[PDB]
RNA sequence: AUCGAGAGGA
């Protein structure tokens, strides 16, 4: 009766932006990234990759409400860096790792199939 | 005193016959007995039936 | 293991098959709201139920 | 619709 459609968790509603960027005014060099129609998968991988960056001072994410489909990622960097650069570099690093993993899994599957 | 209809509403039920409030039936009984008594005065009658 | 992060949960969890029943009391048969609907005849107050 | 009854819920 009040049930939301199942597709609402991954389909952007008309006029909805995938990602929004805001400045965190409490401290310098801090940004809040709001991502719509994403959940713990992307948030967790991005947060961990950001934590791998030595120029990142703070990296965290949360789902404000499980019944909504938004994640907020907060990134603080050193003044010589930018949270936007850190976010972009983290995504690039994750993509590179996934591509390498896919290639090596293909090789391993072929090896196992031949013998 | 006879309360108005809003105090004893008569409701048009599913059957077209109207439904009367309990107060209406009691008032009908009162009117019947009062009329019979008044009849027994305008023409004399035994004190037993009047009582 | 935690589903969101995949980390192990520090405490171990009691888990196993248990017979459960679904009771006839469902929220969609109870949810109710009103904004100026029908009223009673004798008194002009909102109806019941 | 009214009245009554019954079974239930917290």
UniProtKB/TrEMBL annotation, chain A:
InterPro entries found in the cross-reference section: RBP11 (IPR037685), RBP11-like (IPR036603), RBP11-like_dimer (IPR009025), RNA_pol_Rpb11_13-16kDa_CS (IPR008193), Rpo11-like (IPR022905)
Matches recorded under SUPFAM superfamilies: RBP11-like subunits of RNA polymerase
Top-rank taxon: Eukaryota
Molecular-function annotations in GO: DNA binding; DNA-directed RNA polymerase activity; protein dimerization activity
Keywords assigned: DNA-directed RNA polymerase, Nucleus, Transcription
Cellular component GO terms held in the UniProt record: RNA polymerase II, core complex
Gene3D superfamilies: RNA polymerase, RBP11-like subunit
Keyword Nucleus: yes
Annotated localization: Nucleus
Domain DNA-directed RNA polymerase RBP11-like dimerisation residues, every copy: 31-103
BP terms from Gene Ontology: transcription by RNA polymerase II
Coiled coil: none
Family affiliation: Belongs to the archaeal Rpo11/eukaryotic RPB11/RPC19 RNA polymerase subunit family.
UniProt-listed PANTHER family: DNA-DIRECTED RNA POLYMERASE I,II,III, DNA-DIRECTED RNA POLYMERASE II SUBUNIT RPB11
The protein's name in its UniProt record: DNA-directed RNA polymerase II subunit RPB11-a
UniProt organism field: Sus scrofa
High-level lineage: Eukaryota, Metazoa, Chordata, Craniata, Vertebrata
Gene coding for it: POLR2J
Automatic annotation (TrEMBL), chain B:
Localization annotation: Chromosome; Cytoplasm; Nucleus
Name the record gives this protein: DNA-directed RNA polymerase subunit
Purpose of the protein: DNA-dependent RNA polymerase catalyzes the transcription of DNA into RNA using the four ribonucleoside triphosphates as substrates.
Coiled coil, from the record: none
Signal peptide interval: none
Family recorded in the similarity comment: Belongs to the RNA polymerase beta' chain family.
From TrEMBL, chain C:
Gene: POLR2B
Protein name according to UniProt: DNA-directed RNA polymerase subunit beta
The organism's place on the tree of life at top rank: Eukaryota
Record localization: Nucleus
Organism in which the protein naturally occurs: Sus scrofa domesticus (domestic pig)
UniProt similarity note: Belongs to the RNA polymerase beta chain family.
Function, in words: RNA-dependent RNA polymerase that catalyzes the extension of a non-coding RNA (ncRNA) at the 3'-end using the four ribonucleoside triphosphates as substrates. An internal ncRNA sequence near the 3'-end serves as a template in a single-round Pol II-mediated RNA polymerization reaction. May decrease the stability of ncRNAs that repress Pol II-mediated gene transcription.
């Amino acid at each position: 009766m009040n049930a939301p459609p199942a597709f609402e968790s991954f389909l952007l509603f008309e006029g909805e932006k995938k990602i929004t960027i805001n400045k965190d005014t409490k401290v310098p060099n801090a940004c809040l990234f709001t991502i719509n129609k994403e959940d713990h998968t992307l948030g967790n991988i991005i947060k961990s990759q950001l934590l791998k960056d030595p120029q990142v001072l703070f990296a965290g994410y949360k789902v404000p409400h499980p019944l909504e489909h938004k994640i907020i990622i907060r990134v603080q960097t050193t003044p010589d860096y930018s949270p936007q650069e850190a976010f972009t570099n983290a995504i690039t690093d994750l993509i590179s790792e996934l591509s390498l993993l896919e290639e090596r899994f293909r090789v391993a599957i072929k090896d196992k199939q031949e013998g | 005193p006879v309360p108005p209809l809003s105090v004893r509403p008569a409701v048009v039920m599913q059957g077209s016959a109207r439904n009367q409030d309990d107060l209406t039936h009691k008032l009908a009984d009162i009117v019947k007995i009062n009329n019979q008594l008044r009849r027994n005065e305008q023409n004399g009658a035994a004190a037993h039936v009047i009582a | 293991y935690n589903g969101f992060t995949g980390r192990k949960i520090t405490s171990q969890i009691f888990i196993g098959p248990t017979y459960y029943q679904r009771l006839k009391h469902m929220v969609d048969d109870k949810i109710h709201s009103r904004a100026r609907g029908p009223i009673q005849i004798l008194n002009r107050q909102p109806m019941e139920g």
